[PDB]
UniProtKB/TrEMBL annotation:
Keyword Endoplasmic reticulum: no
Species name: Leishmania major
Binding sites annotated in the UniProt record for tetradecanoyl-CoA: H2, A3, F4, W5, L159, V161, R166, E167, R169, L170, A171
Gene that specifies this protein: NMT
Residues annotated as binding Mg(2+): L165
Domain Glycylpeptide N-tetradecanoyltransferase C-terminal as annotated: residue spans: 219-402
Identification of the protein by name: Glycylpeptide N-tetradecanoyltransferase
Length: 411
């Protein structure tokens, strides 16, 4: 059923995954010495290319490939339009490996045809808490705890094959070449997400959306006017009333994050993330990179209420091309990122996220039900969407867990 994925070190069925109790590798160990030096074979009219993601014209090439060929919804109404500044941010975190940015281009004219990117991440991915409880009942705590140390692994994103080269088995070649380059750096696990079902997720979370500009969202068919709003004399007026927000944040001491906040944000964030079964571990430099504000890309606010920072939230921006509607060019979406609340209820913290996003002209706020995102869905008028983000590991056996046990935000 899966001519490529049946050859890979991933659990092959939900039934296999349901049987996994402890975290650990799928493969017996390999060595860097075992891995081919030479890039994976490709047709001789193509070549491998490692873009320099600190070079504006190489970023622009990838930007255009993804603008025209990256993820669409199933109804080909919207297509992500990640910006050039977003790609630089996403692809170049501290200690990133340039060789893990993998492209295919035509040899003759250097046209970019396909892309996949890996970045390093330090992830806790040991056996989940409940399975450790049972393991300790049975005298198996040691085996269950064996892989508890945060691991330096690869996070994969931005897999894209030009629309004219689809269904030619080029994505398996991309994946094999990325695997080779990662393996050559002595890393043997990856984490990735997808909206499609592949063998085999360890978690799956529904999408959620919070309308900020419902008139536009209805016009572009992101949203509809539900049937119950039809029993109003003015359905759209009542939809705008449902979703209206303050212009000014409510929390005293809210302000944008600055570099001197990095140590305190790291502390409260890590204290929080550490309570989840799967979660990243961030250095000061990584907190700085992934959370300090960057115009048009990432937006991060702290609560510093006559006291050291006690709370913070972040969101990032991905516009989507409105490919199915001529009246608008872009859908300006905010995505809930990391946050931590120690002094105020989480719903009060995230209400200010929505207030700030609306004031900055975002049309919708999106998230997946990871972290404690379910805890403010109803009060803040998030609605469940039509899809799921599935979380996967490469070469890591892992029990099925709930999405509320996942603390890794993907970009
Ligand atoms: C240790 C280090 C390891 C590093 C690697 C870790 C693994 C990383 C894995 C990648 C994580 C990516 C995370 C993200 O970026 S998810 C975002 C993926 N990108 C898009 O959706 C953008 C638009 N679509 C395209 O560009 C193409 O349709 C793609 C490139 C998706 C497939 O190209 P194409 O449509 O021309 O098909 P093919 O004939 O070449 O290939 C068909 C095979 O590809 C399998 N397929 C289809 N969709 C996906 C998918 N999203 N992840 C993994 N595999 C996928 C499919 O089941 C089939 O295999 P099998 O069913 O026959 O077995
Ligand atoms: C808004 O316009 C578009 C354009 C293309 C596809 C889709 C469907 C979708 N794949 N949504 C998410 O992945 C997603 C949903 C909710 C929260 C976060 C989401 O995605 C993130 C960014 C993509 N990488 C994973 C996180 C929507």
């Amino acid at each position: 059923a899966h001519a490529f994925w049946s050859t890979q070190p991933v659990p092959q069925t939900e039934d296999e995954t349901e049987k996994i109790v402890f975290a650990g590798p799928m493969d017996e160990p390999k060595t860097v010495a075992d891995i081919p030096e030479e890039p994976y074979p490709i047709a001789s009219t193509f070549e491998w290319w490692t873009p320099n993601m600190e070079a504006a014209d190489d970023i622009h090439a990838i930007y255009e490939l993804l603008r025209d060929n990256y993820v669409e919804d199933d109804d080909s109404m919207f297509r992500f339009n990640y910006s050039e500044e977003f790609l630089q941010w996403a692809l170049c975190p501290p200690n990133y490996i340039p060789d893990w940015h993998v492209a295919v281009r035509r040899k003759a004219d250097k046209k970019l045809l396909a892309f996949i990117a890996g970045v390093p991440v330090t992830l806790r991915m040991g056996t989940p808490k409940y399975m450790k409880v049972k393991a300790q009942e049975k005298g198996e705590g040691e085996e269950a705890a064996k892989y508890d140390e945060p691991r330096h692994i690869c996070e994969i994103n931005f897999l894209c094959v030009h629309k004219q080269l689809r269904e030619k088995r080029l994505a398996p070649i991309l994946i094999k070449e990325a695997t080779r380059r990662v393996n050559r750096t002595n890393v043997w696990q990856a984490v990735y997400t997808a909206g499609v079902l592949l063998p085999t997720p360890y978690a799956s979370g529904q999408y959620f959306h919070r309308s900020l500009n419902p008139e536009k969202l209805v016009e572009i068919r992101f949203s509809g006017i539900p049937a119950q709003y039809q029993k109003f004399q003015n359905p759209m007026a009542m939809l705008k009333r449902n979703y209206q927000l303050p212009s000014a944040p409510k929390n005293s001491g809210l302000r944008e994050m600055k570099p001197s906040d990095v140590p305190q944000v790291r502390r409260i964030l890590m204290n929080y993330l550490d309570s989840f079964d799967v979660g990243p571990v961030f250095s000061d430099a990584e907190i700085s990179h992934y959370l300090l504000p960057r115009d048009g890309v990432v937006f991060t606010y702290v609560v510093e209420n006559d006291k050291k920072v006690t709370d913070f939230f972040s969101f990032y921006r991905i516009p989507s091309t409105v490919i199915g509607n001529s009246n608008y060019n872009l859908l300006n979406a905010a995505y809930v990122h990391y946050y931590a609340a120690t002094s105020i209820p989480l719903h009060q913290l995230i209400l200010d996220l929505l207030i700030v996003a609306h004031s900055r002209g975002f049309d919708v706020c999106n998230m997946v039900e990871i972290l404690d995102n379910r805890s403010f869905v109803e009060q803040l008028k998030f609605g469940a969407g039509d899809g799921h983000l599935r979380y996967y590991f490469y070469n890591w056996a892992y029990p099925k867990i709930k999405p509320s046990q996942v603390a890794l935000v993907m970009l």
